[PDB]
Each structure stands twice: as C-alpha cells, then as structure tokens.
mmCIF file of C-alpha atoms in Angstrom:
data_model
loop_
_atom_site.group_PDB
_atom_site.id
_atom_site.type_symbol
_atom_site.label_atom_id
_atom_site.label_comp_id
_atom_site.label_asym_id
_atom_site.label_seq_id
_atom_site.Cartn_x
_atom_site.Cartn_y
_atom_site.Cartn_z
ATOM 1 C CA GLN A 75 -54.634 62.484 45.807
ATOM 2 C CA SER A 76 -53.471 59.712 43.433
ATOM 3 C CA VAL A 77 -52.248 56.145 43.690
ATOM 4 C CA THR A 78 -50.323 54.404 40.921
ATOM 5 C CA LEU A 79 -50.318 50.625 40.393
ATOM 6 C CA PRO A 80 -47.279 48.974 38.910
ATOM 7 C CA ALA A 81 -47.945 46.885 35.845
ATOM 8 C CA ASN A 82 -46.898 43.830 37.921
ATOM 9 C CA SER A 83 -49.655 44.311 40.484
ATOM 10 C CA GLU A 84 -52.169 41.752 41.596
ATOM 11 C CA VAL A 85 -55.496 43.604 41.930
ATOM 12 C CA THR A 86 -58.402 42.517 44.130
ATOM 13 C CA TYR A 87 -61.945 43.862 43.830
ATOM 14 C CA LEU A 88 -64.400 43.590 46.723
ATOM 15 C CA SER A 89 -68.158 43.726 46.617
ATOM 16 C CA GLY A 90 -69.723 46.671 48.400
ATOM 17 C CA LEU A 91 -69.871 46.034 52.136
ATOM 18 C CA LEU A 92 -72.696 46.983 54.462
ATOM 19 C CA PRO A 93 -72.763 46.836 58.251
ATOM 20 C CA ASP A 94 -73.885 43.562 59.722
ATOM 21 C CA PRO A 95 -77.598 43.142 60.399
ATOM 22 C CA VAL A 96 -78.212 43.096 64.139
ATOM 23 C CA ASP A 97 -79.663 39.606 63.690
ATOM 24 C CA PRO A 98 -78.244 37.961 60.537
ATOM 25 C CA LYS A 99 -80.812 35.210 61.220
ATOM 26 C CA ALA A 100 -83.849 37.516 61.053
ATOM 27 C CA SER A 101 -86.322 37.106 58.212
ATOM 28 C CA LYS A 102 -85.677 38.786 54.895
ATOM 29 C CA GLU A 103 -88.323 41.314 55.954
ATOM 30 C CA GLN A 104 -86.963 42.171 59.422
ATOM 31 C CA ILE A 105 -83.247 42.086 58.581
ATOM 32 C CA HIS A 106 -81.823 45.522 59.315
ATOM 33 C CA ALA A 107 -78.833 47.450 60.591
ATOM 34 C CA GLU A 108 -78.606 49.752 63.586
ATOM 35 C CA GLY A 109 -76.251 52.486 64.780
ATOM 36 C CA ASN A 110 -75.198 55.905 63.552
ATOM 37 C CA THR A 111 -72.750 56.515 60.713
ATOM 38 C CA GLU A 112 -69.609 56.462 62.868
ATOM 39 C CA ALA A 113 -70.555 53.165 64.500
ATOM 40 C CA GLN A 114 -71.555 51.538 61.187
ATOM 41 C CA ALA A 115 -68.424 52.758 59.395
ATOM 42 C CA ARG A 116 -66.313 51.180 62.112
ATOM 43 C CA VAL A 117 -68.086 47.860 61.569
ATOM 44 C CA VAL A 118 -67.728 48.038 57.789
ATOM 45 C CA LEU A 119 -64.044 49.002 57.784
ATOM 46 C CA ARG A 120 -63.359 46.030 60.064
ATOM 47 C CA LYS A 121 -65.123 43.763 57.559
ATOM 48 C CA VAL A 122 -62.846 45.146 54.844
ATOM 49 C CA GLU A 123 -59.810 44.385 56.999
ATOM 50 C CA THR A 124 -61.022 40.871 57.780
ATOM 51 C CA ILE A 125 -61.823 39.994 54.165
ATOM 52 C CA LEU A 126 -58.513 41.463 52.984
ATOM 53 C CA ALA A 127 -56.479 39.648 55.660
ATOM 54 C CA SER A 128 -58.064 36.373 54.585
ATOM 55 C CA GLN A 129 -56.392 37.095 51.202
ATOM 56 C CA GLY A 130 -52.991 37.878 52.640
ATOM 57 C CA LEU A 131 -53.666 41.606 52.150
ATOM 58 C CA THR A 132 -53.587 44.561 54.558
ATOM 59 C CA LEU A 133 -55.246 47.967 54.823
ATOM 60 C CA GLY A 134 -51.995 49.376 53.440
ATOM 61 C CA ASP A 135 -52.757 47.473 50.202
ATOM 62 C CA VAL A 136 -55.969 49.475 49.620
ATOM 63 C CA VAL A 137 -55.719 51.614 46.513
ATOM 64 C CA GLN A 138 -59.307 52.866 46.150
ATOM 65 C CA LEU A 139 -62.163 53.288 48.642
ATOM 66 C CA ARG A 140 -65.634 54.336 47.522
ATOM 67 C CA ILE A 141 -67.925 55.241 50.433
ATOM 68 C CA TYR A 142 -71.664 55.689 49.924
ATOM 69 C CA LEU A 143 -73.463 57.393 52.801
ATOM 70 C CA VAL A 144 -77.197 57.690 53.471
ATOM 71 C CA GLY A 145 -78.372 60.982 54.944
ATOM 72 C CA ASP A 146 -79.031 61.128 58.692
ATOM 73 C CA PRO A 147 -82.316 62.862 59.713
ATOM 74 C CA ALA A 148 -80.678 64.537 62.741
ATOM 75 C CA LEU A 149 -78.295 66.256 60.280
ATOM 76 C CA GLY A 150 -81.129 67.670 58.172
ATOM 77 C CA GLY A 151 -81.180 64.585 55.958
ATOM 78 C CA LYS A 152 -77.511 65.172 55.006
ATOM 79 C CA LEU A 153 -74.676 62.659 54.973
ATOM 80 C CA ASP A 154 -72.817 62.250 58.303
ATOM 81 C CA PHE A 155 -69.334 62.917 56.974
ATOM 82 C CA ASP A 156 -67.939 63.856 60.400
ATOM 83 C CA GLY A 157 -69.049 60.520 61.834
ATOM 84 C CA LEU A 158 -67.416 58.836 58.834
ATOM 85 C CA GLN A 159 -64.167 60.727 59.225
ATOM 86 C CA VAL A 160 -63.814 59.660 62.869
ATOM 87 C CA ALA A 161 -63.999 55.971 61.925
ATOM 88 C CA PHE A 162 -61.863 56.393 58.813
ATOM 89 C CA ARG A 163 -59.070 58.053 60.813
ATOM 90 C CA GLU A 164 -58.929 55.088 63.239
ATOM 91 C CA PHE A 165 -58.087 52.805 60.258
ATOM 92 C CA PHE A 166 -56.066 54.981 57.856
ATOM 93 C CA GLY A 167 -53.293 57.478 58.437
ATOM 94 C CA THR A 168 -52.626 55.994 61.894
ATOM 95 C CA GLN A 169 -49.420 54.254 63.025
ATOM 96 C CA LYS A 170 -50.643 50.643 62.877
ATOM 97 C CA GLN A 171 -51.496 51.545 59.255
ATOM 98 C CA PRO A 172 -49.977 54.788 57.842
ATOM 99 C CA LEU A 173 -51.177 54.639 54.184
ATOM 100 C CA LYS A 174 -54.265 56.368 52.717
ATOM 101 C CA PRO A 175 -55.922 55.237 49.465
ATOM 102 C CA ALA A 176 -57.648 57.243 46.801
ATOM 103 C CA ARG A 177 -61.189 57.701 48.081
ATOM 104 C CA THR A 178 -64.582 59.111 47.261
ATOM 105 C CA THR A 179 -67.533 59.796 49.563
ATOM 106 C CA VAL A 180 -70.921 60.640 48.075
ATOM 107 C CA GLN A 181 -74.410 60.781 49.532
ATOM 108 C CA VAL A 182 -76.712 58.162 48.057
ATOM 109 C CA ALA A 183 -80.490 57.966 48.348
ATOM 110 C CA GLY A 184 -80.551 54.493 49.829
ATOM 111 C CA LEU A 185 -78.883 51.189 50.434
ATOM 112 C CA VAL A 186 -80.283 47.701 50.152
ATOM 113 C CA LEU A 187 -80.241 47.026 53.896
ATOM 114 C CA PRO A 188 -82.806 48.940 56.001
ATOM 115 C CA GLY A 189 -81.238 51.136 58.653
ATOM 116 C CA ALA A 190 -77.859 51.040 56.887
ATOM 117 C CA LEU A 191 -76.183 54.422 56.576
ATOM 118 C CA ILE A 192 -72.925 53.366 54.840
ATOM 119 C CA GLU A 193 -71.641 50.982 52.161
ATOM 120 C CA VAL A 194 -67.932 50.713 51.280
ATOM 121 C CA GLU A 195 -66.423 49.434 48.007
ATOM 122 C CA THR A 196 -62.784 48.419 47.957
ATOM 123 C CA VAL A 197 -59.968 47.955 45.488
ATOM 124 C CA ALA A 198 -56.652 46.643 46.758
ATOM 125 C CA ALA A 199 -53.453 45.700 45.013
ATOM 126 C CA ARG A 200 -50.309 43.915 46.135
ATOM 127 C CA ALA A 201 -47.236 45.005 44.234
ATOM 128 C CA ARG A 202 -44.756 42.338 43.333
ATOM 129 C CA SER B 267 -65.243 50.873 25.952
ATOM 130 C CA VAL B 268 -61.524 51.038 26.770
ATOM 131 C CA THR B 269 -59.140 48.075 27.034
ATOM 132 C CA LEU B 270 -55.866 48.325 28.878
ATOM 133 C CA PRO B 271 -52.928 46.203 27.688
ATOM 134 C CA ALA B 272 -51.400 44.076 30.424
ATOM 135 C CA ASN B 273 -48.308 46.341 30.524
ATOM 136 C CA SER B 274 -50.345 49.349 31.673
ATOM 137 C CA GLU B 275 -49.493 51.447 34.679
ATOM 138 C CA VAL B 276 -52.824 52.404 36.256
ATOM 139 C CA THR B 277 -53.481 55.500 38.396
ATOM 140 C CA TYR B 278 -56.526 56.154 40.622
ATOM 141 C CA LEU B 279 -57.457 59.658 41.758
ATOM 142 C CA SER B 280 -59.607 60.535 44.726
ATOM 143 C CA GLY B 281 -62.911 62.154 43.896
ATOM 144 C CA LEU B 282 -62.417 65.865 43.177
ATOM 145 C CA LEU B 283 -64.723 68.704 44.299
ATOM 146 C CA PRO B 284 -64.944 72.357 43.303
ATOM 147 C CA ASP B 285 -63.337 74.929 45.573
ATOM 148 C CA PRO B 286 -65.338 76.565 48.382
ATOM 149 C CA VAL B 287 -66.462 80.129 47.819
ATOM 150 C CA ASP B 288 -64.665 81.064 51.076
ATOM 151 C CA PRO B 289 -61.974 78.542 52.074
ATOM 152 C CA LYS B 290 -61.188 80.516 55.254
ATOM 153 C CA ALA B 291 -64.788 80.682 56.499
ATOM 154 C CA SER B 292 -65.868 78.585 59.477
ATOM 155 C CA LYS B 293 -66.631 74.847 59.380
ATOM 156 C CA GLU B 294 -70.394 75.140 58.824
ATOM 157 C CA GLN B 295 -70.244 77.977 56.260
ATOM 158 C CA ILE B 296 -67.829 76.221 53.905
ATOM 159 C CA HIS B 297 -69.742 75.896 50.665
ATOM 160 C CA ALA B 298 -69.404 76.136 46.906
ATOM 161 C CA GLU B 299 -71.321 78.319 44.510
ATOM 162 C CA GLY B 300 -71.884 78.597 40.804
ATOM 163 C CA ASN B 301 -73.833 76.511 38.367
ATOM 164 C CA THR B 302 -72.904 73.075 37.054
ATOM 165 C CA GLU B 303 -71.034 74.421 34.044
ATOM 166 C CA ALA B 304 -68.802 76.634 36.204
ATOM 167 C CA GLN B 305 -68.198 74.029 38.921
ATOM 168 C CA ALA B 306 -67.428 71.353 36.323
ATOM 169 C CA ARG B 307 -64.866 73.710 34.817
ATOM 170 C CA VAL B 308 -63.076 74.012 38.181
ATOM 171 C CA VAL B 309 -63.176 70.255 38.806
ATOM 172 C CA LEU B 310 -62.054 69.191 35.343
ATOM 173 C CA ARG B 311 -59.124 71.623 35.683
ATOM 174 C CA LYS B 312 -58.132 69.978 38.982
ATOM 175 C CA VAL B 313 -58.232 66.592 37.221
ATOM 176 C CA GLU B 314 -56.139 68.005 34.370
ATOM 177 C CA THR B 315 -53.627 69.588 36.768
ATOM 178 C CA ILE B 316 -53.318 66.584 39.098
ATOM 179 C CA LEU B 317 -52.812 64.320 36.091
ATOM 180 C CA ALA B 318 -50.138 66.671 34.649
ATOM 181 C CA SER B 319 -48.230 66.645 37.932
ATOM 182 C CA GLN B 320 -47.890 62.891 37.400
ATOM 183 C CA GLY B 321 -46.741 63.091 33.766
ATOM 184 C CA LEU B 322 -50.213 62.208 32.425
ATOM 185 C CA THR B 323 -52.638 64.034 30.115
ATOM 186 C CA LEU B 324 -56.405 63.844 29.575
ATOM 187 C CA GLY B 325 -55.732 61.402 26.735
ATOM 188 C CA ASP B 326 -54.445 58.912 29.310
ATOM 189 C CA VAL B 327 -57.851 58.795 31.050
ATOM 190 C CA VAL B 328 -59.602 55.426 30.815
ATOM 191 C CA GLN B 329 -62.576 55.939 33.120
ATOM 192 C CA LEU B 330 -64.407 59.067 34.270
ATOM 193 C CA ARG B 331 -67.131 58.741 36.892
ATOM 194 C CA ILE B 332 -69.123 61.962 37.374
ATOM 195 C CA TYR B 333 -71.490 62.566 40.291
ATOM 196 C CA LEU B 334 -73.925 65.451 39.825
ATOM 197 C CA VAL B 335 -76.245 67.133 42.310
ATOM 198 C CA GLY B 336 -79.446 68.938 41.364
ATOM 199 C CA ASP B 337 -78.933 72.692 41.246
ATOM 200 C CA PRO B 338 -80.606 74.527 44.171
ATOM 201 C CA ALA B 339 -80.616 77.703 42.070
ATOM 202 C CA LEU B 340 -82.860 75.753 39.659
ATOM 203 C CA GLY B 341 -84.941 74.146 42.413
ATOM 204 C CA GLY B 342 -82.954 70.927 42.535
ATOM 205 C CA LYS B 343 -83.087 70.255 38.805
ATOM 206 C CA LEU B 344 -80.273 68.290 37.184
ATOM 207 C CA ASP B 345 -78.155 70.495 34.901
ATOM 208 C CA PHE B 346 -76.692 67.874 32.588
ATOM 209 C CA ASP B 347 -76.405 70.389 29.753
ATOM 210 C CA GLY B 348 -74.146 72.644 31.802
ATOM 211 C CA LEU B 349 -71.946 69.657 32.594
ATOM 212 C CA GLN B 350 -71.740 68.847 28.899
ATOM 213 C CA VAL B 351 -70.789 72.442 28.034
ATOM 214 C CA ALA B 352 -67.760 72.223 30.349
ATOM 215 C CA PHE B 353 -67.101 68.566 29.578
ATOM 216 C CA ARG B 354 -66.713 69.243 25.864
ATOM 217 C CA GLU B 355 -64.049 71.907 26.495
ATOM 218 C CA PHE B 356 -61.881 69.080 27.907
ATOM 219 C CA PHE B 357 -62.839 65.872 26.031
ATOM 220 C CA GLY B 358 -63.618 64.810 22.492
ATOM 221 C CA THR B 359 -61.513 67.759 21.346
ATOM 222 C CA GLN B 360 -58.994 67.899 18.503
ATOM 223 C CA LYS B 361 -55.656 67.899 20.353
ATOM 224 C CA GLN B 362 -56.929 64.679 21.978
ATOM 225 C CA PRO B 363 -59.920 63.203 20.098
ATOM 226 C CA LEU B 364 -60.479 59.990 22.152
ATOM 227 C CA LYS B 365 -63.350 59.342 24.564
ATOM 228 C CA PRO B 366 -62.914 57.523 27.904
ATOM 229 C CA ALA B 367 -65.313 55.138 29.555
ATOM 230 C CA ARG B 368 -67.628 57.308 31.563
ATOM 231 C CA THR B 369 -70.612 57.232 33.909
ATOM 232 C CA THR B 370 -72.725 60.179 35.058
ATOM 233 C CA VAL B 371 -75.225 59.687 37.880
ATOM 234 C CA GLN B 372 -77.201 62.014 40.099
ATOM 235 C CA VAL B 373 -76.283 61.532 43.740
ATOM 236 C CA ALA B 374 -78.057 63.127 46.676
ATOM 237 C CA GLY B 375 -75.172 65.260 47.910
ATOM 238 C CA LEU B 376 -71.465 65.800 48.267
ATOM 239 C CA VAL B 377 -69.373 66.501 51.345
ATOM 240 C CA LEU B 378 -69.088 70.129 50.267
ATOM 241 C CA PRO B 379 -72.460 71.907 50.567
ATOM 242 C CA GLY B 380 -73.390 73.657 47.368
ATOM 243 C CA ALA B 381 -71.063 71.437 45.316
ATOM 244 C CA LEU B 382 -72.904 70.182 42.242
ATOM 245 C CA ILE B 383 -70.257 67.883 40.749
ATOM 246 C CA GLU B 384 -67.608 65.418 41.806
ATOM 247 C CA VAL B 385 -65.387 63.684 39.262
ATOM 248 C CA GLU B 386 -63.556 60.405 39.808
ATOM 249 C CA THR B 387 -60.748 59.423 37.425
ATOM 250 C CA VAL B 388 -58.829 56.334 36.342
ATOM 251 C CA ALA B 389 -55.840 56.848 34.026
ATOM 252 C CA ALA B 390 -53.211 54.597 32.489
ATOM 253 C CA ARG B 391 -50.075 55.007 30.382
ATOM 254 C CA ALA B 392 -48.746 52.025 28.364
ATOM 255 C CA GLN C 61 -67.190 38.496 47.820
ATOM 256 C CA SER C 62 -63.828 39.268 46.212
ATOM 257 C CA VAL C 63 -62.292 38.805 42.786
ATOM 258 C CA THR C 64 -58.541 39.039 42.273
ATOM 259 C CA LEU C 65 -56.870 39.524 38.877
ATOM 260 C CA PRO C 66 -53.431 38.077 38.118
ATOM 261 C CA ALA C 67 -50.969 40.637 36.848
ATOM 262 C CA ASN C 68 -51.384 39.117 33.341
ATOM 263 C CA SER C 69 -54.857 40.552 32.967
ATOM 264 C CA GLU C 70 -56.192 42.695 30.153
ATOM 265 C CA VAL C 71 -58.831 44.970 31.663
ATOM 266 C CA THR C 72 -61.806 46.483 29.837
ATOM 267 C CA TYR C 73 -63.843 49.452 31.109
ATOM 268 C CA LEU C 74 -67.401 50.080 29.889
ATOM 269 C CA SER C 75 -69.329 53.295 30.117
ATOM 270 C CA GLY C 76 -72.427 53.144 32.261
ATOM 271 C CA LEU C 77 -75.329 51.564 30.419
ATOM 272 C CA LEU C 78 -78.916 52.817 30.559
ATOM 273 C CA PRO C 79 -82.080 51.131 29.252
ATOM 274 C CA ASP C 80 -83.347 52.190 25.855
ATOM 275 C CA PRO C 81 -85.708 55.176 25.643
ATOM 276 C CA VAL C 82 -89.233 54.356 24.547
ATOM 277 C CA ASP C 83 -88.889 56.939 21.736
ATOM 278 C CA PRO C 84 -85.250 57.544 20.749
ATOM 279 C CA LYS C 85 -86.492 60.158 18.264
ATOM 280 C CA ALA C 86 -88.796 61.859 20.719
ATOM 281 C CA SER C 87 -87.933 65.408 21.722
ATOM 282 C CA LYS C 88 -85.265 66.256 24.230
ATOM 283 C CA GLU C 89 -88.150 67.254 26.476
ATOM 284 C CA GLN C 90 -90.189 64.017 26.171
ATOM 285 C CA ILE C 91 -87.374 61.432 25.892
ATOM 286 C CA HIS C 92 -87.860 58.791 28.551
ATOM 287 C CA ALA C 93 -87.504 55.097 29.282
ATOM 288 C CA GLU C 94 -90.222 52.769 30.531
ATOM 289 C CA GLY C 95 -90.677 49.533 32.441
ATOM 290 C CA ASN C 96 -90.004 48.341 35.961
ATOM 291 C CA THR C 97 -86.527 47.599 37.343
ATOM 292 C CA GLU C 98 -86.543 43.898 36.490
ATOM 293 C CA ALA C 99 -87.454 44.590 32.865
ATOM 294 C CA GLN C 100 -84.901 47.407 32.528
ATOM 295 C CA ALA C 101 -82.140 45.450 34.244
ATOM 296 C CA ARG C 102 -82.721 42.647 31.794
ATOM 297 C CA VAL C 103 -82.278 45.174 28.953
ATOM 298 C CA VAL C 104 -79.173 46.736 30.541
ATOM 299 C CA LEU C 105 -77.463 43.440 31.368
ATOM 300 C CA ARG C 106 -78.084 42.372 27.757
ATOM 301 C CA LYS C 107 -76.230 45.459 26.558
ATOM 302 C CA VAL C 108 -73.344 44.353 28.797
ATOM 303 C CA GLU C 109 -73.459 40.837 27.317
ATOM 304 C CA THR C 110 -73.623 42.210 23.799
ATOM 305 C CA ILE C 111 -70.807 44.747 24.223
ATOM 306 C CA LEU C 112 -68.553 42.164 25.879
ATOM 307 C CA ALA C 113 -69.267 39.598 23.155
ATOM 308 C CA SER C 114 -68.279 42.159 20.535
ATOM 309 C CA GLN C 115 -64.923 42.475 22.397
ATOM 310 C CA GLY C 116 -64.278 38.745 22.627
ATOM 311 C CA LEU C 117 -65.370 38.765 26.291
ATOM 312 C CA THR C 118 -68.035 36.847 28.202
ATOM 313 C CA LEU C 119 -70.132 37.554 31.272
ATOM 314 C CA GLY C 120 -67.772 35.258 33.138
ATOM 315 C CA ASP C 121 -65.002 37.767 32.416
ATOM 316 C CA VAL C 122 -66.797 40.441 34.478
ATOM 317 C CA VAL C 123 -64.808 41.327 37.584
ATOM 318 C CA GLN C 124 -66.773 44.333 38.905
ATOM 319 C CA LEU C 125 -70.396 45.390 38.458
ATOM 320 C CA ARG C 126 -71.612 48.698 39.847
ATOM 321 C CA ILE C 127 -75.398 48.977 39.714
ATOM 322 C CA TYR C 128 -77.106 52.323 40.325
ATOM 323 C CA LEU C 129 -80.831 52.131 41.024
ATOM 324 C CA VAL C 130 -83.451 54.856 41.166
ATOM 325 C CA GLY C 131 -86.302 54.382 43.606
ATOM 326 C CA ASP C 132 -89.467 53.087 41.974
ATOM 327 C CA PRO C 133 -92.419 55.502 42.359
ATOM 328 C CA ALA C 134 -94.591 52.354 42.458
ATOM 329 C CA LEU C 135 -92.508 51.457 45.551
ATOM 330 C CA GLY C 136 -92.833 54.868 47.226
ATOM 331 C CA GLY C 137 -89.388 55.800 45.934
ATOM 332 C CA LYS C 138 -87.740 52.638 47.298
ATOM 333 C CA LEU C 139 -85.151 50.752 45.265
ATOM 334 C CA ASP C 140 -86.472 47.568 43.653
ATOM 335 C CA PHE C 141 -83.693 45.224 44.714
ATOM 336 C CA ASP C 142 -85.907 42.151 44.259
ATOM 337 C CA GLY C 143 -86.587 43.061 40.628
ATOM 338 C CA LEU C 144 -82.860 43.623 40.138
ATOM 339 C CA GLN C 145 -82.062 40.229 41.642
ATOM 340 C CA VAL C 146 -84.456 38.414 39.336
ATOM 341 C CA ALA C 147 -82.712 39.879 36.306
ATOM 342 C CA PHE C 148 -79.196 39.612 37.739
ATOM 343 C CA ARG C 149 -79.604 35.873 38.382
ATOM 344 C CA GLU C 150 -80.571 35.157 34.777
ATOM 345 C CA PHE C 151 -77.081 36.458 33.924
ATOM 346 C CA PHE C 152 -74.683 35.495 36.732
ATOM 347 C CA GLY C 153 -74.309 32.399 38.864
ATOM 348 C CA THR C 154 -76.223 30.192 36.393
ATOM 349 C CA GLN C 155 -75.037 26.773 35.208
ATOM 350 C CA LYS C 156 -73.758 27.877 31.793
ATOM 351 C CA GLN C 157 -72.297 31.013 33.429
ATOM 352 C CA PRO C 158 -71.402 30.222 37.064
ATOM 353 C CA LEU C 159 -69.135 33.157 37.944
ATOM 354 C CA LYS C 160 -70.350 36.175 39.930
ATOM 355 C CA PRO C 161 -68.299 39.406 39.967
ATOM 356 C CA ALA C 162 -67.592 41.810 42.750
ATOM 357 C CA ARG C 163 -70.650 44.045 42.770
ATOM 358 C CA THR C 164 -72.205 47.063 44.434
ATOM 359 C CA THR C 165 -75.857 48.129 44.292
ATOM 360 C CA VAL C 166 -76.776 51.550 45.628
ATOM 361 C CA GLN C 167 -79.746 53.857 45.214
ATOM 362 C CA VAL C 168 -78.869 57.142 43.506
ATOM 363 C CA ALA C 169 -81.170 60.184 43.318
ATOM 364 C CA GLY C 170 -81.430 60.203 39.530
ATOM 365 C CA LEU C 171 -80.099 59.124 36.168
ATOM 366 C CA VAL C 172 -79.665 61.125 33.006
ATOM 367 C CA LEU C 173 -82.532 59.369 31.177
ATOM 368 C CA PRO C 174 -85.995 60.161 32.620
ATOM 369 C CA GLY C 175 -87.878 56.997 33.518
ATOM 370 C CA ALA C 176 -84.635 55.022 33.838
ATOM 371 C CA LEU C 177 -84.458 53.006 37.053
ATOM 372 C CA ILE C 178 -81.042 51.372 36.543
ATOM 373 C CA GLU C 179 -77.592 52.136 35.147
ATOM 374 C CA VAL C 180 -74.854 49.475 35.150
ATOM 375 C CA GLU C 181 -71.100 50.103 34.990
ATOM 376 C CA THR C 182 -68.822 47.233 34.052
ATOM 377 C CA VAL C 183 -65.168 46.278 34.385
ATOM 378 C CA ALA C 184 -64.058 43.048 32.723
ATOM 379 C CA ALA C 185 -60.809 41.188 32.287
ATOM 380 C CA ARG C 186 -59.606 38.060 30.572
ATOM 381 C CA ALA C 187 -56.530 36.570 32.205
ATOM 382 C CA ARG C 188 -53.623 35.467 30.030
#
C-alpha cells in the first residue's frame, strides 16, 4: 500500500542489484548469471540484506522495492512472478522480518548481465 | 522539477494496477481489459483514493512514474494519447494546477495480463 | 553501491529526460530522435547537468540515477550498455566530479519518442 517517512529519517538509496555471475572472474564477454527467477531473486534479496546490514540497516528498514523481471521462455516469454513471489515471501512478511515495503514489479526487455532474470532497486530509511 | 523542503513528510505507494475484468475467475484467467485511457482512469482513481485515505491530495504528488504496455487490441502499439486523455482529467487542472515530476516508459508487461498501465507515486506534505 | 542522505537534505526530483528530436517541428507522425546510445546519453546527461545547474545543484548532488535503455536495432535489439558507459563516465567519477550516485540501468520495450534509445530519471539532494 503506502509507507510514510518521517521528516527526521535517514534515507539510503541502493544501486540496482543483479544476481552474482557464476564466475565473477570470467571475461567481460563470458560473464553471466544462471538459475531461474526464484533462485536468482533469492540471491539478489540476500545481497540487499548484506549491503543493508553493512550500513546498520535491516530488511524492516526497506521502504521501497522496485523489481525488474526478464521474461522466461518456458512461461511464454512472460515474467516469472510466481517464482519471484516465492523468494519475496521468504524475506518479507515472515517472522524473522514482518514488515513489507512499497513495491513494484514490472517486466523489462533486458538486463545488463546475460542470463539475468531479475534486478532489484532498494530504498531504505531509518527513522530517528 | 520538484524540490522538497527538509521538513517534508514523504510517502511511497506501491505500483498500482487496474482491476481484473473478473476478480473471482481462476488464477490463469485473471486479466484486465479496456484501452489505455480506460485503464489509466481506474489506476489514477486508485492513486487518488489511496492518497485521500492518508490525508493527501493529487497536489501533494512529487513524482509519478508510469509504466505502459502496448495495446494488444491495437497490435501492441503504444497508446500514449489515451494515457494523456485520462492523465489530463487528474493533473494540470484548475483546482490543482501544479505538475509533478513524471516519467513514462514502455515496459514489456505487468503482473496482471491485459493490464496496459501501472502508476507509481511519491507524495509529500510540508 | 549505496548513497545515504542525512535528514537535513533538500531533495529534488526531475522528470525523465529524453534526447532531442531531430525535427521538433516535424509532424506528430514523423517526430523522432536520432543517434546511437552514447551520443544520446551524452545529450540526456547534459540536460541533467543543465537543469541541476539552474537549480543551484551539481552532478555531485545526484543521489539516484535511473537509466532506461531501448535495444539498439544495430545491436539486434540489445541494449548498448558500452555506449552508455562511455557517456556516463564523462559525467560521473571523473576528477573534477568524483561522486557516483546509486544507479539502475534496465532495458525497457519503448520510450515515448521514436528513435530514442535512452531516458534518464534523476533524484538529487544537497545536504545542509
């Protein structure tokens, strides 16, 4: 629905995050990601957690999540939203972390990393 | 461009979709219908209503991001004019003349089949 | 990586910026932009520079850059990330302007200006 930031909030913007290449040491021309949308989303949400934690922030501090999916051929070229929702539910609305941010999921035509099916963009804010 | 004073209270909405043509139909048949003008009218009303339930109006909007899909009924063509027909009913009006920061891009699809528009909103009251 | 704003920040939101059409007075049916991604990104990033300067802001004040690319027909419909990077680096991470904002680059299906290969959306803030 909606999230409201107090005027005393400290706001942190992340770059869009992609899954890790299977070999981060591969050449610029063979660097690529593997896995289906659910697997890749799980990797990317963990990266968000890790980056946020290194700032003293938690997944409960997320105020806005923008998720860009690439269509999966097995799904008629459509975005794999069900795969995404599985991973997303492991990280948000659970008991370790109950909160859910404002979010948006759209199907894009492509991402910069070959084989990547998901990129996530994050805004977090710690009230004060 | 819009500049927020440092005393602003800022609100983020989730992306908003039009309503399915049959919300009780099965999981694979859920879908939206209508052209861009009609679907934009449903979505902008949801934005209006959600904002009102928080004490905010369309004048409080600072950033509108609009994702359009090509219209299947027109062979996948982008119906930007339809969007602008609906959009003008809500913004740049006389009750509230101001214009928010906005972005309109054509995405490949939305999570609701047949949906041609999603709107993402940022609002702030001093 | 990440950019975090103190709660003293004044935040500025720009509309998405497109490259200029090759004939701004051409018909609604022939209006179109030209050039490859690197050329257009250089035009679009300049509009960001110019608009910020007119607001008392600099490119170092940019906190978030969202870049939407259209696939280049000359690239089989692939996004021209290398062209984008050439242009982007003339503007961010230089020696006069060292800062780099949180950014996201994704490939969309289309933009509202035919022939446009890039739109850039900007959020800026000067701390106080």
